[PDB]
Amino acid sequence: LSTAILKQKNRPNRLIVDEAINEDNSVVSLSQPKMDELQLFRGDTVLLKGKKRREAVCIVLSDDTCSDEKIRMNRVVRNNLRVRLGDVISIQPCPDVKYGKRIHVLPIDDTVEGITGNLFEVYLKPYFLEAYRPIRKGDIFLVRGGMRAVEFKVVETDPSPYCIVAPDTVIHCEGEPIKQEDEEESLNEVGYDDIGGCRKQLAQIKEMVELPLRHPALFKAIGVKPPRGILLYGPPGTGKTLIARAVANETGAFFFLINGPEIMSKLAGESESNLRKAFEEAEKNAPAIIFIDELDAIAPKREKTHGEVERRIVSQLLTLMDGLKQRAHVIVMAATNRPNSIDPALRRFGRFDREVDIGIPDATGRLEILQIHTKNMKLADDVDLEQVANETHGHVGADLAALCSEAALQAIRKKMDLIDLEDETIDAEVMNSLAVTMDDFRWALSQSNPSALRETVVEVPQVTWEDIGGLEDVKRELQELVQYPVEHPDKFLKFGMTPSKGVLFYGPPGCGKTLLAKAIANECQANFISIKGPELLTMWFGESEANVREIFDKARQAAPCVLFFDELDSIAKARGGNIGDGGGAADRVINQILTEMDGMSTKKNVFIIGATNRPDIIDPAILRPGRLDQLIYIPLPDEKSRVAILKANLRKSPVAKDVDLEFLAKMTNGFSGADLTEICQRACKLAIRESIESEIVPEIRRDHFEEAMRFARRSVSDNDIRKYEMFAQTLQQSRGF
Amino acid sequence: LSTAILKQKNRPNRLIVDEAINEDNSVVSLSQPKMDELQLFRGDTVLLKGKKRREAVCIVLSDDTCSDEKIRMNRVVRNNLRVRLGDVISIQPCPDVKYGKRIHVLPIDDTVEGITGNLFEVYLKPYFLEAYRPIRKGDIFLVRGGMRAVEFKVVETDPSPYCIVAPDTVIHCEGEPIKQEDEEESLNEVGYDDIGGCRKQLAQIKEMVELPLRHPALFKAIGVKPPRGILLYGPPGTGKTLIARAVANETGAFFFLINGPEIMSKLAGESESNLRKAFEEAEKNAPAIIFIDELDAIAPKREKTHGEVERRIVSQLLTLMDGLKQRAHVIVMAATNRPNSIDPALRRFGRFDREVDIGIPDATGRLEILQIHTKNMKLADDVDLEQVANETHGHVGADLAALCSEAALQAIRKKMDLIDLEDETIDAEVMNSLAVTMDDFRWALSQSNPSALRETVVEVPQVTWEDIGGLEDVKRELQELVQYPVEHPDKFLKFGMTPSKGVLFYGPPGCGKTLLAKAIANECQANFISIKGPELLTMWFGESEANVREIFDKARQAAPCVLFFDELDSIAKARGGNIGDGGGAADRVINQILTEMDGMSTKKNVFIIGATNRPDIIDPAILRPGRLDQLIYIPLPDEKSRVAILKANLRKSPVAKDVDLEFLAKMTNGFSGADLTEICQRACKLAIRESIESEIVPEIRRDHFEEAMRFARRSVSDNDIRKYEMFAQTLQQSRGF
Ligand SMILES: Nc1ncnc2c1ncn2[C@@H]1O[C@H](COP(=O)(O)OP(=O)(O)OP(O)(O)=S)[C@@H](O)[C@H]1O
Ligand SMILES: Nc1ncnc2c1ncn2[C@@H]1O[C@H](COP(=O)(O)OP(=O)(O)OP(O)(O)=S)[C@@H](O)[C@H]1O
Ligand SMILES: Nc1ncnc2c1ncn2[C@@H]1O[C@H](COP(=O)(O)OP(=O)(O)OP(O)(O)=S)[C@@H](O)[C@H]1O
Ligand SMILES: Nc1ncnc2c1ncn2[C@@H]1O[C@H](COP(=O)(O)OP(=O)(O)OP(O)(O)=S)[C@@H](O)[C@H]1O
Ligand SMILES: [Mg+2]
Ligand SMILES: [Mg+2]
Ligand SMILES: [Mg+2]
Ligand SMILES: [Mg+2]
């Protein structure tokens, strides 16, 4: 019901199509009930448009060539004047459009190449086929007694509609044959189909660019301020320039690209004139889009700058963006790879308030990027893209293109023994029959160094409740504090209470403190930001107080989301504990966390998990009624839950039938979950060794698990069990003394 | 099978050659089955090319001078128009090539030197020898009744093929005799044969430069993006300019060298025009290579710069490299000695993504450099290059050239008593009979200070399993966790488990904590990066947070590789231990190691070793299931393994026969391996003293070892043995409390 806007169905007119044996393109397909509900105006001419000012003409009411009471669609139209079946016809009445001076005809191929002679001897014959020299906007017919592979590039035209040319005007004939680069750089313009992964941000870009420009009166009638400043920020190489280039081609607005280094490459004084002219050009036409690439390169912070020209550039840009009123209809957007260096005077209201985060795509997101990038190459049958999307983790849009290039080149290397190095006249059986296989992708995958290993990884984790063995007590409670306030807000609002925002995890180490948070994030279909203990201590030492500011608000922007603080023990380990150095464990970072976690409003859905295994050195400041008041104890797995833990850990291994899990679960009493995983890893490693020994069968037998128990190592002592139990019954008493 | 691409064999046409007594060069060697499989076109002329536009002509079908049914090859062609036997003939059809204005003949030697007279009296006689003035592209015959040592330098020519000159054109005759420097600086151009050691990086350079330029259509057919930015980085003096100069001479592309300081030597404003002209010159010719030497000198970081001209230069360079599309076919490459000062805006995608590491060569690598450098000098019979390669450790390409220069000059000093200092007319018996001997090399080797002592040393270590005595338990296990996941990935992938990445070494000190890591690195044929304890503490104090970033990723780039953290005790010693100053031992560096070691993907083959001898002060954060979960105990050598330790330590000493190893191994119970090495060192030192005493025999006798036992010193106390045993049984319990 909520997602019933993208669908378009329940209309008994459209039907599925498949491959048929009807390839007769003599006449185009029409519809008899089409004009029956429309009131057209006839008598001189009709104004209509198709796609990219390109339309075809045919015969009208000259049927009776084949059998009626049927329909068909040829597959021939997938290479010109068409991108796919299911294109909506867009017609906008707009007379008096841009016009050139005059162009009649120009030659490209038949200019000087080969024999010329008188030139009216070779193409005059294959022309008289019932056509009185039809002149239109792309009416070209295919007639050839040979290969039927003739094509001439005629793209540039001054008119949108048809027109009648008039005599008594002189035309210059000083043209020149052009190369293929200018046409290829224009035909390969990207659009909304060439971008994948960032399916969410494109909705915002469309709703905030296309809507105000296409319907200016609709926004004025309801009285809404159109956003005129959009800043695109995120990791480098995610494709920030690609959306900017895509939104320009699909809109009828005048696009003006402004580069960052290009502006600074000019001399002193001359650079400001470029910005002034760029704004003036966009101002005199109402549909105009201004994109400033790499804003940080031209608009740095005024508190760190050294040159006086940069300050003048920033001041000029500030004045120019303030001079734009609502009658300009100019949407200024910019892209940068670090939002932190942008001058704060630009990111405030009226200049740049609307911000779009281009984050790192998921396995689903990068799968579509791979499918887009590999759409032009030739792959084999064993080519599995979602696998490669799975193993790739920190890969961004440009990383995938580099990986594809490396995989393609590795395929080139395998054929170097047959392809001559000096002879350039290679045979034609090597440009087509060779495709990229799995050895190529797997080889190139091992030595790929992505540029996106350092940011926060924003997912719904893949860890579900199946990976966690036992612990049925905590599964219900963790749901009761996370899912209820987000699924049924009315039930909470009726009682007039405040849901608790924050849960602390403590207990013996290696028992599921991280898997629980990942599982509770997976089921809620929300994001998951994990921050480790030493991860906070290294990200500070450069004396950077603003580093965590873009971390806390990131969770708020990606609502709903959960915040995880794993390995909290190491954070308190830097100063000790109850006495520590001389006082508590609340060092520089703990105070930061406490100060910022108080500013989160209750009406939000942001949620925080803290996980630690050192309750004796934690400070009372963390456990406040409103920060981490929920204290949940994870006990050691007992006889009943170890079977489930082992079943979860053995889901991917071909375990035998004669092995008894509950039998080997009965003297593994005083262990933890991490100990059981290590036991299983040793047991399966013994299987690998045995399997490879006999080669000079690959199943985990009973003896493989029997040998592991003798070498088993206990991770928690008897004193620690009692100590954990005695803290678990009584923790919050630590507050006060 | 994997390395079957470099070989070229199984063709019954080529055979080995040796020194023969046939030196008749009247006719060249041909092949009768050569045209039998080729369909040539005859009737006017044939187009063909040899090497460097130089070919020889001879008589055709004028045989019957000697016996047939045999073949021979003269040794005379090793000084001109030839570099060696086994050169492939390269022929590329390309008409209409670069042409000059006109040159007929120019005199060089017979211009004004000596007697001239009428000049048509001395060389007209020795010319009429059945030759109707043959004019070609290097058809010179040797005819002289004297020494047969006549040679004139004719190198510059406008045509590649033969041509017929035409009259009715005026030719200027205002030439001048040139010196020998311009010809020597061009004939000594380096190539792929003048560079040794970096055999791996040259493959990447070739595959990423020569392939896209020689076969532009092959890459377009498969749809692969050609790399247009290559950055060469590494230690200074490794030869970064040499590869740049070598790749230009062997390619037919237009090379444009851009120096770093040369650009900045210009005035304000005039420097940008040089870059603009350099790019414009390369753009109008499709085959073009642009090399920017010392990029850091012209493209520094914008956050540290002071002048405004440098920022404009960086912005201009950024704009220019962005303006290059695929139709330019221009590959821009650059070299720098510090990659860290390069502006981050240049090292990202689209400008400089493809990076080549020119590391320090090995003993094998530097051996080839020595062989290349000494190929022009005259050495004696006792000259052993691989020895000198062995003792040289931190020596780079320029260090070896300096060492050779010093060794040559030391040879000059030995003859100063006979060579006159003021008389310049020295006898000819001192420029040839004097060669460099071992006293020269050994003398110059002692006072050589290399410039490459400070980086990370990336090898496969020379320490093998033979150097480690006993410890048969750890040898199998260390293999079972390193070699199996890299040799049989399918066996691991079938069971669907995660191999453990990380092994911690603990135990009594001086027992083989470093030799084990070196041995496991040697057998895997992988790299080995060793980082010591205090080595991390000194590399920090300058408040440099980016220093270790280029350390961790270096191991990933050189896959497979192992990471070693030796002397971990000193790192934890700076803050104490369980209580320490006030808390744990996890100071600034430990948190860094933990944060970065979590980011390594499982699918990689990077592996980490930690070695320590202070398990009581280690913190629980290191021992996490996924960082260093593998805990291996190295016990003290018992009675059985001490014999092997002594045998390993005595492999290079001439040990006598009457000495009994197991007899002296029976009361050396409570020692360690380092104690046995020290015992053997004292025992052999006593032998040196005895050998030199009697001179005013050189074998280690029984009494030499008997005297060492009395002076033996124990390194581990009884309390320490029990304490180590009690921690070894129970370590991981330290996690939690
Ligand atoms: N979602 C995507 N789909 C397809 N190609 C993408 C995508 N994102 C990036 N790319 C490719 O990545 C390359 C570089 O794209 P850019 O837009 O230049 O990256 P960026 O995020 O703007 O950062 P920089 O500063 O420009 S490198 C191009 O070859 C794009 O085609
Ligand atoms: N309930 C469980 N069932 C199965 N495996 C578990 C369970 N709890 C933990 N593990 C395993 O234990 C290892 C680490 O799990 P974590 O949840 O990170 O442990 P932890 O409780 O957070 O304490 P540490 O200090 O991080 S080991 C992984 O290999 C998990 O698969
Ligand atoms: N692999 C090598 N083989 C032979 N000579 C080498 C090699 N590497 C360096 N050299 C010599 O080292 C000297 C300097 O070489 P360069 O290319 O200038 O060094 P570099 O690595 O470029 O660093 P700088 O900044 O130029 S000193 C020359 O005499 C080279 O012949
Ligand atoms: N198993 C062994 N066999 C022979 N020599 C050994 C053995 N173990 C150590 N040594 C010698 O001991 C010395 C130092 O070896 P290391 O492996 O570096 O000692 P360690 O265990 O790392 O502890 P320290 O603190 O570095 S001495 C060298 O001279 C080695 O040859
Ligand atoms: Mg960009
Ligand atoms: Mg955990
Ligand atoms: Mg240099
Ligand atoms: Mg050592």
Short mmCIF file of N, CA, C and O in Angstrom, two decimals, chain B residues 99 101-105 135-136 158-159 161-171:
data_model
loop_
_atom_site.label_atom_id
_atom_site.label_comp_id
_atom_site.label_asym_id
_atom_site.label_seq_id
_atom_site.Cartn_x
_atom_site.Cartn_y
_atom_site.Cartn_z
N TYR B 99 59.26 13.61 -42.93
CA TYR B 99 60.25 13.91 -43.95
C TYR B 99 60.88 15.27 -43.68
O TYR B 99 60.19 16.19 -43.22
N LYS B 101 63.70 18.42 -45.30
CA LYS B 101 63.67 19.25 -46.49
C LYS B 101 64.52 18.58 -47.55
O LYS B 101 63.97 18.11 -48.57
N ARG B 102 65.84 18.48 -47.38
CA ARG B 102 66.70 17.77 -48.31
C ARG B 102 68.11 17.73 -47.73
O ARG B 102 68.61 18.75 -47.26
N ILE B 103 68.75 16.56 -47.80
CA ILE B 103 70.17 16.41 -47.48
C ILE B 103 70.79 15.44 -48.48
O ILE B 103 70.28 14.33 -48.67
N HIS B 104 71.86 15.87 -49.14
CA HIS B 104 72.55 15.00 -50.07
C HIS B 104 73.75 14.32 -49.42
O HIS B 104 73.76 13.10 -49.24
N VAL B 105 74.74 15.11 -49.02
CA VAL B 105 75.98 14.64 -48.42
C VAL B 105 76.55 15.75 -47.56
O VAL B 105 76.38 16.94 -47.87
N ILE B 135 73.35 3.98 -53.64
CA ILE B 135 72.80 4.89 -52.65
C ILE B 135 71.64 4.21 -51.95
O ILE B 135 70.66 3.81 -52.58
N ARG B 136 71.78 4.03 -50.63
CA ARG B 136 70.77 3.36 -49.83
C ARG B 136 70.81 3.88 -48.39
O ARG B 136 71.28 4.99 -48.14
N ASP B 158 66.50 11.59 -43.20
CA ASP B 158 65.07 11.91 -43.20
C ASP B 158 64.15 10.73 -43.54
O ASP B 158 63.05 10.67 -42.98
N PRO B 159 64.51 9.75 -44.43
CA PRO B 159 63.51 8.74 -44.79
C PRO B 159 63.62 7.47 -43.96
O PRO B 159 64.69 7.14 -43.43
N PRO B 161 62.20 4.45 -45.61
CA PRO B 161 62.56 3.58 -46.74
C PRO B 161 63.47 4.25 -47.75
O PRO B 161 63.89 5.40 -47.56
N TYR B 162 63.77 3.55 -48.84
CA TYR B 162 64.52 4.09 -49.96
C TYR B 162 63.67 5.12 -50.70
O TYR B 162 62.44 5.11 -50.63
N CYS B 163 64.34 6.02 -51.41
CA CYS B 163 63.66 7.06 -52.17
C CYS B 163 64.53 7.47 -53.35
O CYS B 163 65.75 7.25 -53.36
N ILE B 164 63.89 8.07 -54.35
CA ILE B 164 64.57 8.57 -55.54
C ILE B 164 64.58 10.09 -55.45
O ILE B 164 63.51 10.73 -55.48
N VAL B 165 65.77 10.68 -55.35
CA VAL B 165 65.88 12.13 -55.26
C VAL B 165 65.63 12.75 -56.63
O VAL B 165 65.81 12.11 -57.68
N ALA B 166 65.19 14.01 -56.63
CA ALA B 166 64.86 14.69 -57.87
C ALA B 166 65.63 15.99 -58.00
O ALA B 166 65.88 16.67 -57.00
N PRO B 167 66.01 16.38 -59.22
CA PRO B 167 66.72 17.65 -59.41
C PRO B 167 65.78 18.85 -59.36
O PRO B 167 64.61 18.72 -59.00
N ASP B 168 66.32 20.03 -59.70
CA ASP B 168 65.55 21.28 -59.74
C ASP B 168 65.13 21.72 -58.34
O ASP B 168 63.99 22.13 -58.11
N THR B 169 66.06 21.62 -57.39
CA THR B 169 65.84 22.10 -56.03
C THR B 169 67.17 22.60 -55.48
O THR B 169 68.18 21.91 -55.59
N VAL B 170 67.15 23.79 -54.89
CA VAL B 170 68.37 24.39 -54.34
C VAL B 170 68.59 23.86 -52.92
O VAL B 170 67.65 23.70 -52.14
N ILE B 171 69.85 23.57 -52.60
CA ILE B 171 70.23 23.02 -51.31
C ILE B 171 71.24 23.96 -50.65
O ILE B 171 72.22 24.36 -51.28
#
